[PDB]
Amino acid sequence: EDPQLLVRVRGGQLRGIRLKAPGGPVSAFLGIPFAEPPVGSRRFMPPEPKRPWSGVLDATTFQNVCYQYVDTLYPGFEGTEMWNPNRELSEDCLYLNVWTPYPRPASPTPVLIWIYGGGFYSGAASLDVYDGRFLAQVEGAVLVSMNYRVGTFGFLALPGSREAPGNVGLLDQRLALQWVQENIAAFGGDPMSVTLFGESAGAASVGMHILSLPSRSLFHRAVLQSGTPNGPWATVSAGEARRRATLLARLVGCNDTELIACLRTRPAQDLVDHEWHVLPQESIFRFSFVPVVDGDFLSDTPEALINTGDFQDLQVLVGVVKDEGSYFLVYGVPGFSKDNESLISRAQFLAGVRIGVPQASDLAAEAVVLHYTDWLHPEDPTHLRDAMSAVVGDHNVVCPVAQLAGRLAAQGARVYAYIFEHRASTLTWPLWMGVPHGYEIEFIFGLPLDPSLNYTTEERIFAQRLMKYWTNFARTGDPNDPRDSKSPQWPPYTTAAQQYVSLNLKPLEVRRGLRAQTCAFWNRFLPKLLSAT
Amino acid sequence: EGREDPQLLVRVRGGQLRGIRLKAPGGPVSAFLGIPFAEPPVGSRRFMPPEPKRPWSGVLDATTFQNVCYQYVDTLYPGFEGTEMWNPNRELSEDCLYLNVWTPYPRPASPTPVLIWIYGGGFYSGAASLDVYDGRFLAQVEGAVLVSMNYRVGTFGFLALPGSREAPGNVGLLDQRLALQWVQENIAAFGGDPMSVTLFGESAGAASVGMHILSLPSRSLFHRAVLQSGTPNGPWATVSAGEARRRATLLARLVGCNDTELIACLRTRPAQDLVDHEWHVLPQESIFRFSFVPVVDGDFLSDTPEALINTGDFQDLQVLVGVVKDEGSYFLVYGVPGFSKDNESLISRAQFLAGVRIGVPQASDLAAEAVVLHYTDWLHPEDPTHLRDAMSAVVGDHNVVCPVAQLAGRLAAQGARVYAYIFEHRASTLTWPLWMGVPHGYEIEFIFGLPLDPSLNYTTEERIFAQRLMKYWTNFARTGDPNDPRDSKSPQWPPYTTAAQQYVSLNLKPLEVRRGLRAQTCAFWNRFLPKLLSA
Ligand SMILES: *[C@@H]1O[C@H](CO[C@@H]2O[C@@H](C)[C@@H](O)[C@@H](O)[C@@H]2O)[C@@H](O)[C@H](O)[C@H]1NC(C)=O
Ligand SMILES: *[C@@H]1O[C@H](CO)[C@@H](O)[C@H](O)[C@H]1NC(C)=O
Ligand SMILES: *[C@@H]1O[C@H](CO)[C@@H](O)[C@H](O)[C@H]1NC(C)=O
């Protein structure tokens, strides 16, 4: 019985496990319950805090993955399987994980809290790419990750109702953040220094805690990687959530109380079986059950809240990868596949745009096509393919990120922005996809430091650089190394200069304007268009 | 006769002419100036199609330029060479239908390719007698036979009550057509080859050349064409029949006037009264918009220039087209608040937004906003210098560059051999401020060879540049190809194609080939804005 592996938290005693990291041991406390299992009459309901337990709770293994759809498009392919559940599925999944250095930190250590992505319909804190042992061992960080409900279980809503108020998945995350405030000191983490970080939906989630007052006293800094609370996919209106919910009810055969009561009797997989049949149009980068503008967790739309918020005492790091949209193209656009170079025709490009920008009118879709066509090579298949990727990546991530960076900076926040451009030597997706959505993560978590994973020695040095930026940012709100001249320095993003840095194998390079002309098209012109026509 | 220079006596269908021997840097040239080609379109003839000049007796003196067609005279900058060089240089009169011919001295041995110049001036001004249109250099150095004609402008040449008998519209274009017929019948008397006639012009002169290409009856009067900074398609070269009727009747009201009665009353008004109200009929405050221009009458223009260039067969046609580096600058000081030739014209964002409404007068609020968003440099959205140059670009692209890009593309896709250029050299002698760059109209003095005149103070490189350009234009007139058949060394000027979109830069440096004439931006004007319009 190793005393470094024994901790007492408000609910009782835990026993963690000593894990091996390249440079030494780390202490890990896996599968800690933070809420009562949201099962049975608790489905669709806000989480309740976990009741105290007797004895010593075993926290040496990952708990179950929240019930969710499992990808089958490319069976056996590592590019997709790496995101699939790696533990048993179950609605009983509200558990979090903590990694800390071994022996546990002498003094209070800044805490990093990871919120995974997966379109709000999938993901889990147990995936290999979210392994917190590297950051814990190399930087001495206390890393926390929680499971939160996805899909219908976490976001199906009958707005205004008592039994499916919506956003419970964000409330699960909030409860895990409260748990960190109340218990993280027992592990040597500083509750006064908590940095939230996440990617994609995880990033939009971090964004939603920034915009919801009750979350604000639970963290101090934030990192949003390829995702935002604003934008076309992260939220839906009350009306649309109600619409998708009742359409799902109907599809499984079911006054809000009775509808929800009937939904609660259905096996989990029945709900997942019809999840994807409620989207209003054929599309990509669109998810059935996501946060809802409820006038509660989200007092107004993310757009309204970021345009009028006071972000004075907040530091934020945000960024995108080089090819945000490639990955999504193979999941719905005719002509695209991971197995060929996906050289498409102009006709397939125009078709792709209606799928890529599903809420777009014919005039608006025409404007997108004319803006993205390279008029010197309007029929070149390679140009048309890369353009289709750009349309999807810009519309969904880059421009919504440029928009958020700008409002937070204009309104008092300290902002740092980046563009990640290194393509992992180990990537299994084809070259035409470039640096896809989600592939910067393994670097920030430091996986290249595991010699058995076969990353190049340059990638290992790169990952160390990134872990430093993130942890420096967590410690101080500034990603630059405190004692180190010559770098060059990563400057704050501002509305005036619009500076951001490229993260790749070469030293930091400062650039200006995040797709400035193109995002002006998405952020200023298209809005003006559709609100008139 | 008896003692006169035997090389200056020539006979044409209407009678005997006596020209004058003029001095050109490299030697003498023969000039026949002020040859009447139509009956004076005065009195009951105002607004009427021209009638061929009736024969005269004796020897008509053709030694000086004739009257300039009645027109508005610019006074915005009194005394300034930049504006005066375009002003009338001979008496104003409605009796102005005369043309000019320059030919080598002694006249060429065998038939020489003919170049016919059609001046610009927004269809409301101009004259073939201006110094920049002096044909003595092309005649002396390239042995060209050059012809230029005066054609009616303003109300006198384009006021129309479409469908009427007394003001059919497009008579100024008919004046030009009459002069082209005069060349077919008489140019051989001067040594010119009527079977090799190339039309060239700038701005409204260029749109004019374009209208002769789209009008069947003019097609048999020429073989090749050059359009400098102008097109028959675009926002200013033509108006609909309804709009022309509207402007004509509003002008009639302003001077105190059934079409016959209205026109008859207009004919009693002094020429100067019509000029004094010419600018009061435009529908919106604007720049690069002219009151009386060619009308889509369903006769001279069977349909809109857009329709005709989209559906025409341009199989056996060779065309040279181009623009200058800063097509819009000149126009900004005639109506956009914040611009002046006397200061740097650094403007604010608000002045830019206001300038766009004036520069794109037909644009809806949404369309004007799309223009502003497209032209704004989002890394420095408030920088005065960028906003100023952007205002110039908006005007130049909307009115000249994109309409030219559009024309080249349709002509090429439909059988024509097209050559395209962008002229980027700023005359060392320009008197407009530097911020205007190479303004609209300033490639002309180089194409005509004025730098070859030692007394005009051009640099020696400009003199060599002028010679290069004169060779390109005359080679094109001779063969339909600007390239010198011998010289393989000099890079070649390749044809413009929808596939490759090649065009050359014309400046002091050797030809440089470039691809895509403002391709992204012209896609905005030529493809997106129209579609915005359908809603
Ligand atoms: C540039 O000039 C514009 C028009 O002003 C006129 O021209 C200048 C040169 C003076 O002679 C003045 O008396 C005239 O009224 C101004 O509207 C514009 O703001 C000026 N730009 C600046 C700020 O210098
Ligand atoms: C790529 O493969 C998909 C299906 O496997 C097909 O629809 C598409 O046309 C292919 N494209 C190419 C490059 O042939
Ligand atoms: C040309 O330069 C001479 C010498 O400076 C000067 O006297 C003359 O006025 C100039 N003429 C022109 C065209 O500017």
Can you tell me the distance from the alpha carbon of B177 to that of B218, in angstroms, rounded to the nearest whole number? 6
Q: Which residues of A67-82 are buried (b: 16+ CB within 10 A; e: fewer)?
A: bbbebeebeeeebbee
Strand partners, A6: A15
Strand partners, A292: A236
Ligand 2 atom closest to the Cα of residue A341 is: 13
What would the two tokens of residue B304 be? Answer: 């809109």
Residue B340 and residue A491 in contact, taking contact as beta carbons nearer than 8 Å: no
Residues of B in Cβ contact (< 8 Å) with A367: 528
Three-state DSSP class for B285? Answer: coil
Shortest Cα–Cα distance, B382 to chain A (Å):
10
Residue A207 and residue A298 in contact, taking contact as beta carbons nearer than 8 Å: no
SS (H, E, C) A467-485: HHHHHHHHHHCCCCCCCCC
Shortest Cα–Cα distance, A113 to chain B (Å):
34
What radius of gyration, in Å, describes the C-alpha atoms of chain A?
22
Q: Note the ligand closest to the C-alpha atom of A337.
A: 2
For B524, residues 6+ apart whose C-beta sits below 8 A from its C-beta are A370, B370, B374
* DSSP, res B292: S
Can you tell me the distance from the alpha carbon of B155 to that of A314, in angstroms, rounded to the nearest whole number? 67
- Residue A72: C-alpha distances to residues A79, A84, A237, A331 (Å): 12, 9, 30, 11
Task: Reply yes or no on whether A341 is catalytic.
Answer: no
Nearest CA among B399, B400, B404, B204 for reference residue B292: B204
Can you tell me the distance from the alpha carbon of A211 to that of A204, in angstroms, rounded to the nearest whole number? 10
Nearest to B378 among A363, A370, A517 (CB): A517
Strand partners, B101: B32, B147
Chain A interface test: which of B496, B520, B522, B534 (most A C-beta within 10 Å): B520
Ligand 2 atom closest to the Cα of residue A343 is: 13
Residue spans of beta strands (DSSP E) within A164-220: 189-199
Task: Reply yes or no on whether A200 is catalytic.
Answer: yes
Can you tell me the distance from the alpha carbon of A298 to that of A510, in angstroms, rounded to the nearest whole number? 35
Residues with CB under 6 Å of ligand 2 are: A 335, 337, 339-343
Nearest CA among B128, B59, B36 for reference residue B90: B128
Tell me the one-letter amino acid at A414.
Answer: R
Can you tell me the distance from the alpha carbon of A24 to that of A134, in angstroms, rounded to the nearest whole number? 10
Q: Which residue of A has its CA nearest to B522?
A: A375
Tell me the one-letter amino acid at B392.
Answer: S
| Residue A220: CB atoms within 10 Å | 20
Can you tell me the distance from the alpha carbon of A457 to that of A448, in angstroms, rounded to the nearest whole number? 8
Can you tell me the distance from the alpha carbon of A199 to that of A223, in angstroms, rounded to the nearest whole number? 9
Most distant CA pair in chain B, distance: 77
Chain B interface test: which of A346, A368, A370 (most B C-beta within 10 Å): A370
- Residue A181: C-alpha distances to residues A184, A220, A467 (Å): 6, 12, 23
Residues of B in Cβ contact (< 8 Å) with A532: 366
Which value in Å is the resolution of this experimental model? 2.3
What sign does the dihedral A492-A494-A497-A499 (CA atoms) show? Answer: positive
Can you tell me the distance from the alpha carbon of A301 to that of A294, in angstroms, rounded to the nearest whole number? 9
Residue A413 and residue A492 in contact, taking contact as beta carbons nearer than 8 Å: no
Q: Interface of chain B against chain A, CB under 8 Å? A: 366, 369-370, 373, 376, 378-379, 501, 515-516, 519-520, 522-524, 527-528, 531-532, 535
Q: How far is CA B254 from the centre of its chain?
A: 29
Backbone angles phi, psi at B189, to 5 degrees: -60, -20
Question: Looking at the 3D structure of chain B, how many domains does it have?
Answer: 1
Q: Which residue of A has its CA nearest to B519?
A: A375
Shortest Cα–Cα distance, A368 to chain B (Å):
10
Can you tell me the distance from the alpha carbon of B281 to that of A65, in angstroms, rounded to the nearest whole number? 75
Ligand 1 atom closest to the Cα of residue B341 is: 9
Can you tell me the distance from the alpha carbon of B98 to that of B70, in angstroms, rounded to the nearest whole number? 13
> Between chains, do A513 and B366 touch, taking CB under 8 Å as contact?
no
Tell me the residue range of the domain where A276 lies: 1-533
Can you tell me the distance from the alpha carbon of A280 to that of A61, in angstroms, rounded to the nearest whole number? 40
Residue B523 and residue A370 in contact, taking contact as beta carbons nearer than 8 Å: yes
Can you tell me the distance from the alpha carbon of B90 to that of B280, in angstroms, rounded to the nearest whole number? 26
DSSP 3-state percent helix, strand, coil across chain A (nearest 5): 40, 20, 45
What would the two tokens of residue A100 be? Answer: 């800390």
Angle formed by the axes of helices A238-251 and A268-275, to 10°?
Answer: 120
Can you tell me the distance from the alpha carbon of A236 to that of A359, in angstroms, rounded to the nearest whole number? 12
Burial, B79: exposed, middle or buried (Cβ in 10 Å; 0-12, 13-18, 19+)? exposed
Strand partners, A45: none
Can you tell me the distance from the alpha carbon of A204 to that of B390, in angstroms, rounded to the nearest whole number? 37
Burial, A353: exposed, middle or buried (Cβ in 10 Å; 0-12, 13-18, 19+)? buried
Three-state DSSP class for B288? Answer: coil
For B60, residues 6+ apart whose C-beta sits below 8 A from its C-beta are B15, B16, B17, B18, B35, B36
Can you tell me the distance from the alpha carbon of A410 to that of A407, in angstroms, rounded to the nearest whole number? 5
Q: What is the residue whose two structure tokens read 């109907």?
A: A250
Q: Supply the CATH number for residue A229's domain.
A: 3.40.50.1820
B431 lines ligand 3 (CB under 6 A): no
What radius of gyration, in Å, describes the C-alpha atoms of chain B?
23
B141 CA from centroid of ligand 2 (Å): 62
What would the two tokens of residue A361 be? Answer: 């009118």
Nearest to A513 among B378, B527, B532 (CB): B378
B457 lines ligand 3 (CB under 6 A): yes
DSSP A104-132: --SSPEEEEEEE--STTT---TTSGGG--
Nearest to B501 among A376, A498, A524 (CB): A376
Can you tell me the distance from the alpha carbon of A51 to that of A31, in angstroms, rounded to the nearest whole number? 15
* DSSP, res A133: H
Q: How was this structure determined?
A: X-ray
Ligand 2 atom closest to the Cα of residue A381 is: 13
Tell me which of B457, B458, B459 to substitute to probe ligand 3's pocket, judged by most ligand atoms within 8 Å of the beta carbon.
B457
Residues of A in Cβ contact (< 8 Å) with B516: 375-376
* DSSP, res A264: T
Three-state DSSP class for B80? Answer: coil
Can you tell me the distance from the alpha carbon of B234 to that of B122, in angstroms, rounded to the nearest whole number? 13
Three-state DSSP class for A512? Answer: strand
B456 lines ligand 3 (CB under 6 A): yes
